[PDB]
Paper text:
From the results of limited proteolysis experiments (Petrovic et al., 2014), we engineered a deletion construct of the MIS12C in which three of the four subunits carried N- or C-terminal deletions. The resulting construct, referred to as MIS12CNano, did not crystallize, but addition of residues 1–71 of human CENP-C (CENP-C1–71), coupled with in situ proteolysis (Dong et al., 2007; STAR Methods), led to crystals. We collected X-ray diffraction data to minimum Bragg spacing of 3.5 Å from a native crystal and obtained initial phases from a tantalum bromide (Ta6Br122+) derivative in a different crystal form. The MIS12C is an extended rod, with a long axis of ∼200 Å (1 Å = 0.1 nm), in line with the previous low-resolution EM analyses. The four MIS12C subunits have similar topologies and span the entire length of the complex in the same orientation, so that all N and C termini cluster at opposite ends. The MIS12C subunits form two distinct subcomplexes, MIS12:PMF1 and DSN1:NSL1. The sturdy arrangement of helices in Head1 and in the helical connector of DSN1:NSL1 provides a composite binding site for CENP-C. The main chain of CENP-C resembles a “horseshoe. Its first visible segment (residues 6–22) is extended and binds in a shallow groove between the α1 and α2 helices of MIS12 in Head1. The CENP-C main chain then takes a turn (at Phe17CENP-C and Cys18CENP-C) to move away from the stalk through an extended and poorly conserved segment for which there is weak electron density. The CENP-C chain bends again to complete its “U-turn” around residues 28–30, emerging in helical conformation (residues 32–44, Figure 2C; a more detailed description of the interaction is in the legend of Figures S3A and S3B).
Residue numbers in the entry:
A (entry chain A): 2 to 200
B (entry chain B): 31 to 203
C (entry chain P): 6 to 22, 28 to 48
D (entry chain D): 116 to 155, 159 to 193, 203 to 245, 258 to 317
E (entry chain N): 32 to 204
Write the structure that this text describes.
């Protein structure tokens, strides 16, 4: 029992039972209003009578009797009609889900959720490292261009030196020197041999 | 498939049909005897005004609550959602008393798309860093193989030092 | 006058549900005419 | 010692009969409590009543012990009130959880939205960024390589004069053959 | 000591009702009593009577003065049902429009973190400290020096075998 109708009131903005209570305190008050109408109308009509009074505390208790009858039948009828109102209206048939919470049909586990947000932070930081990794690689390459050009420059100096050497006679001073000493070694050998003869 | 406004009007109309029937003229007469002996036509007029003003008053009340907060449009919306969804026949999702479960259920997709966005971005950055790093490695290969050639020709020029050595050796007595 | 029923319990002791039930006109006439006499 | 009226009688005859016996014994207790204050035998005419309607109290308790009004002493609005008072605290707790859970994300969104204005570890290529050779060392290596080049060049240009002196000396000595 | 000698009755109402029923006997006892004191002595007989009934009866292990009765009036039910309705419509409103505002905040902070992540793309790590350049002021000087030495040893190798020619020419006749 005791049904709060927490979903039936989510769509309407009020509990159906409270609305039925407001409807009741409306209808009953209207009934007693028309009873005040008939009572004071039979009271004003009473002043113009021949014979004796047959009134006024007598003519009121009768209105109280018919008022008790009307409260019985009106109360029962309102109870059944209110049950009807809570059955066919103001009721979410449980067959139907409101569009307010359309996505909550498929639940998402909390392990997958904490795992997912943790993976989100991890991938944020991971990207943040990959970016400056790109920056450092591009910087090391851009700076590496300079040392490559400098080594190419020194190699260009050595090639130009072998070109200035290739011209003027002696390409590389390796076969020349070993031929300069040998022909000199003879020039000394024939020098001594001509100093021993000149005596 | 009856509009809930029509069922409401039928419940009010039938409720009055059973109140005006329960409030029989005999029931208003046998108790209001003292008055009924004289002018049995004045009593009829008073009962008529009573019952008519009563039923028009209560019908005016329900007509006033239908315009209370646009309740006709609310009930028409409910009929719409019922017809729009009466295809499942299965018990719908009623909100369990765990706010974090529902909130995570609605928040899940907007976190999935973020996780996969950052996934694609970090994979693009990963591939770019891969190829770029390969270019760096090739550059290192080139600079080292250049240093080797510089040293090679340098030693090639330092080789004739010995040639000068035995040159000055044989040039001295 | 001024003597009435004032409590009117809002959520105390009443049964629940109805699905496809022959278009509920029958249940309209049947919810009335229950248990009451003068 | 009014409590002594309780333990006075009848533990084995259920509870309703003990309640009736409690009724009679309480009646006699009040009767005996009224006696010590009698001013004006007037005492003798009293018992003729007390015994009479005390016996009629015995037959009244014995009569309505059977019908049901006495045994109704020993046995749902309260249940639905309990379920309602549990529901209201459960929805209190849930309402608190919703308020706090909402303020959390509100101040989180305001904090992160007002926070951005007011080589790393675990990298993918972490091995490549750590095998970085010293390039300035290579530039200095060239700077001294050119110095070694100049000193070897000066050694050679010194040896060509070391030779030139011997060539002029030899070409002048061989001219002295005249 | 051994307690619960009092009659165990699960209802306080029945005791009061049957007690009010049997009060007419001790009320009838006041006939054989002087009219000077009959009224306060019947009040004393009543209070001591039903007092002796209550002190020797216990509801549910609870004394007559400390035991509550499950009889709720209409005021308690009106207040409790009022607060209950308040919390039903309140928790309903929370379930309805709270996940939407929370969704607004989280969907703001997600694209906010992505936006502050995009502005980080100018990481700009400087690096490349580098070194001092030595150009070619003496490089051309070393090349010209190598020209002088190269042609000098070329002419030396040209004129030395002529000196060997003059040498072996004077070694015979």
């Amino acid at each position: 029992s005791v049904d709060p109708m927490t979903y039936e009131a989510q769509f309407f903005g009020f509990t159906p039972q409270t609305c039925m209570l407001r409807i009741y305190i409306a209808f009953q008050d209207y009934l007693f209003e028309v009873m005040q109408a008939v009572e004071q109308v039979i009271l004003k009509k009473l002043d113009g009578i021949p014979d004796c009074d047959i009134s006024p505390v007598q003519i009121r208790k009768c209105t109280e009797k018919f008022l008790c009858f009307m409260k019985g039948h009106f109360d029962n009828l309102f109870s059944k009609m209110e049950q009807l109102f809570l059955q066919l209206i103001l009721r979410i048939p449980s067959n139907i889900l409101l569009p307010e919470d359309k996505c909550k049909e498929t639940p998402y586990s909390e392990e997958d959720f904490q795992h997912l947000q943790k993976e989100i932070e991890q991938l944020q930081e991971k990207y943040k490292t990959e970016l400056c990794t790109k920056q450092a690689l591009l910087a090391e390459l851009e700076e590496q261009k300079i040392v490559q050009a400098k080594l190419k420059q020194t190699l260009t100096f050595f090639d130009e030196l072998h070109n200035v050497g290739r011209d003027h006679g002696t390409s590389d001073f390796r076969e020349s020197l070993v031929s300069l000493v040998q022909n000199s070694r003879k020039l000394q050998n024939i020098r001594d041999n001509v100093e021993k003869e000149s005596k | 498939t009856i509009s809930r406004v029509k069922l409401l009007d039928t419940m009010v109309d039938t409720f009055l049909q059973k109140l005006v029937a329960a409030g029989s003229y005999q029931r208003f007469t046998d108790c209001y005897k003292c008055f009924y002996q004289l002018q049995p036509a004045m009593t009829q007029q008073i009962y008529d005004k009573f019952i008519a003003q009563l039923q028009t008053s209560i019908r005016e009340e329900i007509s006033d609550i239908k315009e209370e907060g646009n309740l006709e449009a609310v009930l028409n919306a409910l009929d719409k959602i019922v017809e729009e969804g009466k295809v499942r026949k299965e018990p719908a999702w009623r909100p369990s008393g765990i706010p974090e479960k529902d909130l995570h259920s609605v928040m899940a997709p907007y976190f999935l798309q973020q996780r996969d966005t950052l996934r694609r971005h970090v994979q693009k950055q990963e591939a770019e860093n891969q190829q770029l790093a390969d270019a760096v490695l090739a550059g290192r290969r080139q600079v080292e193989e250049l240093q080797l050639q510089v040293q090679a020709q340098q030693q090639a020029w330092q080789a004739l030092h010995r040639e000068q050595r035995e040159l000055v050796a044989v040039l001295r007595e | 006058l001024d003597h009435l029923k004032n409590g009117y319990r809002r959520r105390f002791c009443r049964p629940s549900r109805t699905e496809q039930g022959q278009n509920v006109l029958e249940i309209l006439q049947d919810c009335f005419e229950e248990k009451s006499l003068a | 010692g009014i409590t002594e009226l309780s333990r006075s009688i009848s533990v084995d005859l259920a509870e309703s009969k003990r309640l009736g016996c409690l009724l009679l014994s309480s009646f006699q207790f009040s009767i005996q409590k009224l006696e010590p204050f009698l001013r004006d035998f007037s005492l003798e005419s009293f018992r003729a009543k007390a015994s009479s309607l005390s016996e009629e109290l015995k037959h009244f308790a014995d009569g309505l012990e059977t019908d049901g009004t006495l045994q109704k002493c020993f046995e749902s609005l309260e249940a639905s009130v309990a379920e309602m008072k549990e529901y209201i605290t459960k929805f209190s707790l849930e309402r608190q959880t919703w308020d706090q859970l909402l303020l959390h994300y509100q101040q989180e969104a305001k904090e992160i939205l007002s926070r951005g204005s007011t080589t790393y570890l675990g990298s993918s290529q972490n091995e490549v960024l750590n095998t970085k050779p010293d390039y300035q060392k290579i530039l200095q290596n060239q700077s001294k390589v050119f110095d070694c080049m100049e000193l070897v060049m000066d050694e050679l240009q010194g040896s060509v004069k070391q030779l030139q002196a011997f060539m002029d000396e030899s070409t002048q000595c061989f001219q002295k053959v005249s | 000591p051994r307690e619960d000698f009092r009659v165990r009755c699960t209802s306080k109402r029945a005791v009061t009702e049957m007690l009010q029923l049997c009060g007419r006997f001790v009320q009838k006892l006041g006939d054989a009593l002087p009219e000077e004191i009959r009224e306060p002595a019947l009040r004393d007989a009543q209070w001591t009577f039903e007092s002796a009934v209550q002190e020797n009866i216990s509801i549910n292990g609870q004394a007559w003065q400390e035991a509550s009765d499950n009889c709720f009036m209409d005021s308690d039910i009106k207040v409790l049902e009022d607060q209950f309705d308040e919390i039903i419509v309140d928790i309903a409103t929370k379930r309805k429009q709270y996940p939407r505002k929370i969704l607004e905040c989280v969907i703001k902070t997600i694209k906010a973190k992505q936006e502050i992540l995009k502005q980080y793309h100018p990481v700009v790590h400087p690096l490349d400290l580098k070194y001092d350049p030595d150009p070619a002021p003496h490089m051309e000087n070393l090349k010209c020096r190598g020209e002088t030495v190269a042609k000098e040893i070329s002419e030396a190798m040209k004129s030395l075998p002529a000196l060997i020619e003059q040498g072996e020419g004077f070694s015979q006749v």
